[PDB]
Amino acid sequence: ASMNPPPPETSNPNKPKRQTNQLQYLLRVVLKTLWKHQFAWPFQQPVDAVKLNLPDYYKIIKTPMDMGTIKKRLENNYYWNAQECIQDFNTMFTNCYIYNKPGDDIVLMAEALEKLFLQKINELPTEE
Amino acid sequence: TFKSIMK
Lengths: 128, 7
Prior knowledge:
The complex is a heterodimer of chains A (128) and B (7).
Chain A: H1 21-35, H2 57-60, H3 67-75, H4 82-99, H5 105-122
Helix pairs in contact in A: 1-3, 1-5, 3-4, 4-5
Chain B: no helix or strand
């Protein structure tokens, strides 16, 4: 195979929606802070394995995830639980570590973003 | 690698 898969779903009108202080925090503080990090750009959209000429990317990574998708999910109220969003961030980081090798610059970039992510998640507000 | 220089 060579083609990219369709990108992850970001909206589903059939799913119930709610606003919570934790979901708001995840968009306003966590996602936004990570987005503006200098090393954020490789994580701001789905991996285009065609453009990058990486035909094995989607043979190795079967649960792709990226911050562009996460951001849109938050904006579309796709997540009911903060934990769903946190899981998507963790999937993004682990995919990077699984596909690439320890010494790669892209892994260094991911590790920097992850450190910041954990700092912000450690400050997650108690549910209101 | 190219993954850290283009998207």
